[PDB]
Design a protein around this nucleic acid. Structure first.
Ligand SMILES: [Ca+2]
Ligand SMILES: [Ca+2]
Ligand SMILES: [Ca+2]
Length: 424
DNA sequence: ATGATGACGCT
DNA sequence: AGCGTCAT
């Protein structure tokens, strides 16, 4: 019987990363309730990142700034840079590369988003294990680590108590014990996080466990600027009252149908179903994955990949701003094509690859899906005017309008994705 | 009128 | 190829 303790995997999360970037640049924003906003005009701007001081007053992501200031009147706002009429996230993409380069010195990392990376510590841990002459692990090597499920009046008091219980029972004589291995992973993640902070001023959270889903769950248990070790043995207690929708990839329609088809609420309850039963309800792939997951077993690998596989540029045109003339459809395409070329040229010189395919996506008024339609064409020159002309060429026939100069039904979204990279 | 992106599965 | 799901 396999237990999914082959690997040591971590998820590192830059807590409210865009806010940290702005608070490093503007010291007057540090240790204050504050948030980062996109587009000041409509209701003060849509909030895309919130410091923990502001989260205490109820300010959340996607809330309008004008509504946020009702919950939190002293809230400081930093504004996202705008280029060619759209939000430009270049400042944060650069900072994110800063952090992942430091992370790369410690283990192999998979960029999960601008602010999160998975980390495969298996080889790093094995190496570090030979280097420790069977020596004990000091609690002073784990100054921000929580041990989930432990211990069994002061918050710092609880943490150390749990950690001392953990360390006391540790079997340092067995170089293949998965609990010892997780502990060494956790010392390394402490080291990687002290270096990120030392070399960028950014703080981050982490979770350490045996796979990606446990690492991501562990990461969210103690935030901010804290890390959590979730061992294989903590899983049954942890899953016993864990809502299904908190497990990675179960927050959407699949999760809700697990809840509804099976009549359960919590991840642990999935253990009473056979793998064939789960496969018959959710399909061979989903059932196998579920069967193992509710037991803390998951095999999705940490892909060694710091660089995205698509480079894309989108802008929404909601409400009355939706595009309705051929003229303005062509101008935004041009605006979108131009920011895309800057990014592509920076990527050709920075990462020695060239993209070869161009995906144009649009969304129409009334349709409530992300994309209404997706068409592709070749990407031969990094030239904004060719790319916009070709993007337009590829979507023209969607215009059902009669008047030449008009576009119906209005476009609420324009999207240009460069993909199918190749070595250059 | 929760945006701008990104990864991936299915057919 | 083109659409759907899940996520930050
Ligand atoms: Ca928003
Ligand atoms: Ca944590
Ligand atoms: Ca899956």
């Amino acid at each position: 019987m396999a237990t999914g303790q082959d690997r040591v995997v971590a998820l590192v999360d830059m807590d409210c990363f865009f806010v940290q970037v702005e608070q490093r640049q503007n010291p007057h924003l540090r240790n204050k309730p504050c948030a980062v906003v996109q587009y000041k005009s409509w209701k003060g701007g849509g909030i895309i990142a919130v410091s923990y001081e502001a989260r205490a007053f109820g300010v959340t992501r996607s809330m309008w700034a004008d509504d946020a200031k009702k919950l939190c009147p002293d809230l400081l706002l930093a504004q996202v840079r705008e280029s060619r009429g759209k939000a430009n996230l270049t400042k944060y993409r650069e900072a994110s590369v800063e952090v992942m380069e430091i992370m790369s010195r410690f283990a192999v990392i998979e960029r999960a988003s601008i602010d999160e990376a998975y980390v495969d510590l298996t080889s790093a841990v094995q190496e570090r294990l030979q280097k420790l002459q069977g020596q004990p692990i000091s609690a002073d090597l784990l100054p921000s680590t929580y041990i989930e499920g432990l211990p069994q009046v002061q918050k710092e008091g609880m943490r150390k108590q749990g950690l001392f219980q953990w360390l006391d029972s540790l079997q340092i004589d067995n170089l293949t014990s998965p609990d010892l291995q997780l502990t060494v992973g956790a010392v390394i993640v402490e080291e990687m996080r002290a270096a990120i902070e030392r070399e960028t001023g950014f703080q981050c959270s982490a979770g350490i466990s045996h796979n990606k889903v446990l690492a991501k769950l562990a990461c969210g248990l103690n935030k901010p600027n804290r890390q959590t070790l979730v061992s294989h043995g903590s899983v049954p207690q942890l899953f016993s009252q864990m809502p299904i929708r908190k497990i990675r990839s179960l927050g959407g329609k699949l999760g809700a149908s697990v809840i509804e088809i099976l009549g359960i609420e919590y991840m642990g309850e999935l253990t009473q179903f056979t793998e064939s039963q789960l496969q018959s309800h959710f399909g061979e792939k989903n059932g196998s994955w579920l069967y193992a997951m509710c037991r803390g077993i998951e095999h999705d690998p940490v892909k060694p990949r710091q660089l995205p596989k698509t480079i894309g540029c989108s802008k929404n045109f909601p409400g009355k701003t939706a595009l309705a003339t051929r003229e303005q459809v062509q101008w935004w395409l041009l605006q979108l094509a131009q920011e895309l070329e800057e990014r592509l040229t920076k990527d050709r010189n920075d990462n020695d690859r060239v993209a070869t395919q161009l995906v144009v996506s649009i969304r129409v008024q009334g349709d409530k899906r992300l994309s209404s339609l997706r068409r592709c064409c070749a990407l031969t020159r990094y030239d904004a005017h060719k790319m916009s002309h070709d993007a337009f060429t590829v979507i023209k026939n969607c215009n059902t309008s009669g008047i030449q100069t008009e576009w119906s039904p209005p476009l609420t979204m324009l999207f240009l994705c460069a993909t199918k990279f190749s070595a250059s």
